[PDB]
Amino acid sequence: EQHVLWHTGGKGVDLVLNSLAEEKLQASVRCLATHGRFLEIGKFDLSQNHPLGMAIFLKNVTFHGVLLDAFFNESSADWREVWALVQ
Amino acid sequence: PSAAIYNIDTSSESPDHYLVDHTLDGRVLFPATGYLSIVWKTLARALGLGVEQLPVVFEDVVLHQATILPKTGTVSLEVRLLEASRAFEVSENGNLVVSGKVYQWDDPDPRLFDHPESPTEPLFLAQAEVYKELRLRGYDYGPHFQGILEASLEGDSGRLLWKDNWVSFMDTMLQMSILGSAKHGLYLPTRVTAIHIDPATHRQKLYTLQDKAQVADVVVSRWLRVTVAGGVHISGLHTESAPRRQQEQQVPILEKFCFTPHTEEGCLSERAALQEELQLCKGLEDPLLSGLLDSPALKACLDTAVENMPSLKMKVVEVLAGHGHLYSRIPGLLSPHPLLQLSYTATDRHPQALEAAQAELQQHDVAQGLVCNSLFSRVSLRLVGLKKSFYGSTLFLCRRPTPQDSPIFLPVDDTSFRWVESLKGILADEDSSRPVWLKAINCATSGVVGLVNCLRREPGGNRLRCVLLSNLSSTSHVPEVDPGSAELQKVLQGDLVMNVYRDGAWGAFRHFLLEEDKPEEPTAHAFVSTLTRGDLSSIRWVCSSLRHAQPTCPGAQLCTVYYASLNFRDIMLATGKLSPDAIPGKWTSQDSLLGMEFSGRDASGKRVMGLVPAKGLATSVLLSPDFLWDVPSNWTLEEAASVPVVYSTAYYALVVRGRVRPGETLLIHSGSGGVGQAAIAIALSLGCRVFTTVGSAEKRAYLQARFPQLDSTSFANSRDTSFEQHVLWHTGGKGVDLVLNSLAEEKLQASVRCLATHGRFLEIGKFDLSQNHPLGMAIFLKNVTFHGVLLDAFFNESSADWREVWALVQAGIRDGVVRPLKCTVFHGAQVEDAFRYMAQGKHIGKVVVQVLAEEPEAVLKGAKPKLMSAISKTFCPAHKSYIIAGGLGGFGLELAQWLIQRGVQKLVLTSRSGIRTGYQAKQVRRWRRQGVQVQVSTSNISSLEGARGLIAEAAQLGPVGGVFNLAVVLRDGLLENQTPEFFQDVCKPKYSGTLNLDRVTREACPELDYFVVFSSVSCGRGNAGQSNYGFANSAMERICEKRRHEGLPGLAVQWGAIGDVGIVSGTLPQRMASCLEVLDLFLNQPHMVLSSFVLA
Amino acid sequence: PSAAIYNIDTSSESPDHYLVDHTLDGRVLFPATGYLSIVWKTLARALGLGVEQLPVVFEDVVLHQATILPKTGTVSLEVRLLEASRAF
A5, A48, A52, A79: which to substitute to probe chain B, counting the most B Cβ within 10 Å? Predict the structure, then answer.
């Protein structure tokens, strides 16, 4: 957190691809810049229903819960897009 | 036993007596770190360890309420902590005030307290000016909390005192954190992320100075959002501004200083009631009976009598006080004069009168037994003044005869002040008992008025200096008069302290006349603002800064406004719940911030509508052409005023951010609101299934009439959480795809429980986000996206997305998707009514203000706004230059800041030395970073060549607009018995300097419009020690009078005691904010010399 | 005094003998609603009212651990509640 906040001039980053556990997810969300996007691909912190402070959304921030497992049941329209991108 | 209770006593003997030094704003508040101290003590007691042996860690500290400490009383705080849950709470009357987490560190790492390296100077900021700045900002800290020993200019490094007190130490760390940040108003901490304390490292990080004091180093890092000092480490401090108490403990006594002739003939004219009443009585207590009684003519006579009173003591006797009622006005008129002991007695020949005993109880006395409403010579009295009007009534006044002889005449009219020794010799012997008559003849530019005022109260020879002879013929040698033995006889017959001949008439200068209410001028550019914060009855039209400066840069354009729309932010700002600093933008100048959209005509007369970040409610708006749309021919401007912000927010939320696809389910909260209606229209145009929560049945009926594609299954109730069950049952337990939420707590959770898989939550509310309420992150297992949507971010940067939003809005306007809402029209003279109407949520659609009626034409070029009367205000063009003489210290810096906030881009400051103190350097650096070019010059003002060079240097930057004289040299404490010629000579840098300024401005300053000099009360009321000071100030007023008579601008202000920059003559210090406010009021007045002071 | 302590005994004479019928999997576990019962009783005692006279509301109940009831022994549960914070 201190490293990125010092090497970006106190602005932060635009995208965070987070796969770390508690007391590090909060650090990661504290590294977000304005109009930042948080991409959560972890499971433990989500499965335990840990709290999240909603004051971070005053920075015009988007929070994403990303799970690839949902494509094996329905919604093949997005899977075609992903397949085309991979190809 | 689990609840530890702490009693807080602020008595002189209590161990917690130091808390009396925490007076953030007229109120003693418990320090935010006192809660941490007591929680730490409670945890240490629970663990059975001492505080100094327990390294502790705080997390997610939240403050919910402010604790006020009464002077006579005691408050109790109960703290309970859950060791298993690792939490704590603080409550007073069972009401939560602090919550968070606390636990033992049990593994202290000293590397956490290493000072981070700064991203980036002999000058530094010392304690006195640091706390002067804090006092100016609002913080009235006391000696116990004044722990900042030294601070850097930018406020990122310094030194902190250690007094074996953690509360004061942490309060000083917070003070250092808030010092550097530049915000207007007081900011109190509300949320802190983490605090670490390691007392062993704290003791290891302390060093001693030569003064045998213990200090620690503090650094503040804004990039890392961390404040570390000694063994304390605060991270993620959050502060929010609090409203001003508005104590208004500085009531300004305001007057004007005028020359009053002794014999006023035909006064009380140009009236209204008296003129008609004269013929009404001719055809056929009372205004006609008392016309001159309430006029300021009586006040001048009363002031003259007071000045004639030998000592401050005065005895007044009322005769026949059974019919007349002048006893109810004389005591009131003497209140403004400070240090006056008045004994008033009412005597009536008939004791049966005087039934108003309660009126006499207002500091008056009763009794039973010269002013009255060829017999004068029979009593052998001397007539001083006569007041005759169109009432035939006459007001007389006779002096008290006091025989005297040996009239000493001393010619004061002379340079080099060699007469001072002669005056000392005349006033040397105490056993003189002979009047002294000062004479000024060959120079109307004499300040002997102030000298006689100050010398008259001198200890020893007080009554010796009796009167002056000043010939102030303020004309181009038009009149002519010369003194002499015959001329002296008329003056010497009446022993009057003041004897002034002004262009034909003999009289005296009066400092008793009061002032009037606000001035108004007819202008074409104005806006609306709340004169007093939080009051909706103080909303009026105020002249704007767009008239003086209209640069109209390529990325700007000036448009005339016909209709303006009101929003919720406007209500919050007007009623005071919202702070002006929450508005995003460079709004460091206190001004109106009301309005976000408008409709009218541009420079070419094209009918245009647009969106602005602020200052929407105005007669004209300057904005970039990017934030503009063309009104279609089928629309009128009235309904066009309601489109921009609503549809912009709706499109940005739905299309740009939500990326809604046709054939989806949406939940739109508060469907009757503007944003709700726009979202409904967009979703229906895209062909989507829509659920809307509605407040009442009438709103449901209106929505059904407006959108015929909605059925009875699409409506829910917005006043509770039943909409969750409704949507979950009508969607078969699946939920909706998009939620446009604008509802508060216990309804946001219900809304998020209505989300389906791959759902998108669009949050456009603020309260629940501002309070940092928790959100369960188990909802993200449903592959859900959470959106925080704020349109305000587009007014600063990232125009790429704004172009997309603009294109979407334009495309919607091209087809029939975008429809104007219904509007309620309020005229421009009823803005208060509009605010009151919208304050209650009984309206449907939009509330708009008709600034100007729409013309029937289509392209009306040259649409000059109609003239409108508004409150006058002072603004300056950006192409001019202004000079402040001696403005590099005290009042000068504050005046320069005030002028800069009013639109000044070129400043020249003169001082004997350079920038010496760190405060001046900090102010100059901050002003230079703002884009204002400021020059400090060492050119003298008393020399002709120095004044010419200074004026040339100022003109090099640009045309000179105004000159402000603030230079002062104080040879004070100089009684007349020890006053030499040299000291009174050196006490005149604002005499030769002012004369040179006058001459040079008259020579080569044809665009000048401001000419301001700063006087003092001692020039009109007198002070013992400042004789030469008053002498300078009086003639500095005289020159202003002459230059005003000549037609050029001229103003002199008599200031009382001024605080925030350090009682004189019984006058309390005046706060800087009130000083600037009264200065702004004075600058628009038509009088030449004005006074301002606070009575003791 | 703020911490109410409850002793759970599964003996044949104890009033809480019926808890022996909770054997989810070869193990006697404290019922998830026994916690609600004891918290309700503690709140009623704190308010000075009977359980049958106190309508109560629970919110955001989270279970962190499973309590095993030994056949020969006794476990003690301490319940503490913060009236101002409205938690337990």
Answer: A52
Helix and strand tally (H, E) in chain A? 4, 4
Q: Are strands B520-523 and A51-53 parallel, antiparallel or unpaired?
A: unpaired
Longest CA–CA span in chain C (Å) reads: 41
Least Cα separation, residue B92 to chain C (angstroms): 9
Residue with tokens 């739109």: B668
* B426: three-class secondary structure by DSSP: helix
Nearest in space to B1060 (alpha carbons), one of B129, B132, B27, B130:
B132
Residue B437 and residue B86: Cα distance in Å, rounded?
86
Q: Rounded to whole angstroms, how far apart are CA atoms B355 and B31?
A: 56
How many Å apart are CA B690 and CA B676, to the nearest integer?
A: 11
Please report which helix (H) or strand (E) contains residue B754, including its range. none
Within the 123-162 window of chain B, which residues sit less than 8 Å (CB to CB) from chain A?
none
Q: Are B569 and B596 in contact (CB under 8 A)?
A: yes
Cβ B288 vs Cβ B391: under 8 Å: yes
Exposed, middle or buried by CB within 10 Å (0-12, 13-18, 19+), for B289? exposed
B523: number of CA atoms within 13 Å, CB side? 22
Per DSSP, the three-state class of B410 is strand
C1 interface with B at CB cutoff 8 Å: yes
Q: Amino acid letter at B128?
A: A
Beta strands in B24-139 (DSSP E): 56-63, 75-82, 87-91, 96-104, 125-126
How far is the C-alpha of B912 from the C-alpha of B935, rounded, in Å?
14
* Binding-site residues of B for NADP(+): 666-683, 881-896
| Residues of A (7-66) whose Cβ lies below 8 Å from B | 9-10, 30, 34-35, 40, 43, 45-66
Both tokens of B211, joined, read 């003064």
Q: In what order do the strands lie in the sheet with B436-440?
A: B258-261, B505-510, B500-502, B465-471, B436-440, B408-411
| Strand intervals (E) in B852-957 | 868-871, 881-885, 906-910, 933-937
> Which residues neighbour A61 within 8 Å (Cβ) at sequence distance 6 or greater?
A32, A34, A35, A36, A37, A38, B788
Q: Which residues of B touch C46 (CB under 8 A)?
A: none
Integer Cα distance of C84 and C86 in angstroms? 5
Q: Hey, which chains touch C, using 3+ CB pairs under 8 Å? A: B
DSSP letter assigned to residue B335: S
A65 and B783: CB-CB below 8 Å? yes
Q: What is the CA radius of gyration of chain C?
A: 14
Cβ within 8 Å, pair A10-B222: yes
Q: Which two tokens stand for residue B876?
A: 């300056």
Q: How far is CA B793 from CA B240, B652, B802, B1071, in A?
A: 19, 12, 10, 37
Chain B residues in contact with C2 (beta carbon < 8 A): 1-3, 80
Q: How was this structure determined?
A: cryo-EM
Phi/psi at B721 (5° precision): -95, 25
C85 contact B CB<8A: yes
Question: Is B810 an 8 Å CB contact of chain A?
Answer: no
**CA distances in angstroms from B199 to B44, B53, B698, B1053, listed in the order given:** 13, 7, 65, 56
Whether residue B338 contacts residue B1095, with contact meaning beta carbons closer than 8 Å, is answered with yes
Which residues lie closer than 8 Å to B278 by C-beta, 6 or more apart?
Answer: B288, B390
Q: Which residue has the tokens 């070869």?
A: C26
Cα(B107)–Cα(B105) distance, rounded to whole angstroms? 5
Chain B positions touching C85 (Cβ under 8 A) are: 89, 96, 99
* CB within 8 Å of chain B, chain C residues 65-84: 80, 82-84
Terminal CA-CA length for chain A: 35
